[PDB]
Swiss-Prot record:
GO MF annotation terms: DNA binding
Classification via InterPro entries: Sulfobus_virus_coat_C (IPR022014)
Pfam families linked: Sulf_coat_C
Subcellular location: Virion
Protein name: Major capsid protein
Key words of the record: DNA-binding, Virion
Entry function: Self-assembles to form a helical, filamentous nucleocapsid. The capsid proteins wrap around the DNA and maintain it in an A-form by non-specific desolvation and specific coordination of the DNA phosphate groups by positively charged residues. This certainly protects the viral DNA under conditions such as the extreme desiccation of its host.
Subunit structure: Homodimer.
One GO CC term, this protein: helical viral capsid
Organism for this UniProt entry: Sulfolobus islandicus rod-shaped virus 2
Amino acid sequence: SRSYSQRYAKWQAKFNAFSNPTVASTILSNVSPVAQQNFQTNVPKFTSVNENVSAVLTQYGITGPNRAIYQGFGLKVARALNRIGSGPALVNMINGLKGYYISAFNANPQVLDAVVNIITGSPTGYVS
DNA sequence: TATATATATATATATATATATATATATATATATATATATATATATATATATATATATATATATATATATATATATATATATATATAT
């Protein structure tokens, strides 16, 4: 276990280390092509979500930051999908997620279902 | 010891020719400048008057696009760390 004093102390030491020209460049240049792979591998998956969800939002007349609300929701759905996969667990996730957005951010349930209807292909609850 | 010839100089006497300068007298031509008088042309600037075009900036008014940051609101992805929980 670690107290704040300890949390910070070590954080500082590592931050300092990293800031060193040679340390930063050593690490970053070594993980360059690796990171590139990872970025390329997963990012396109979410871009397509942003696109399709955007299309939906335009059909629903959603503008400004309100689009951003639903986009965040959609992205979250996709995230869970990637880290969990479709089926039961995803259903459990989406149900809670909807509750989160509906009541915490006053997102419109109906539109939220429209978002799910794209990413998953249908509203949740039932697997299909 | 003298004389002669051939070259390298210096002088005594004047003259001539050829080059390198300086002056006395004016004029002419050709170049390198400076001025007196105006005008013209061509370039290098500065100003008086406005306008136009092209570039280098600053602002007044809003909007748009492209990059460099900071924040407001959440979410996502990718990397750099710290922790909460176990493996």
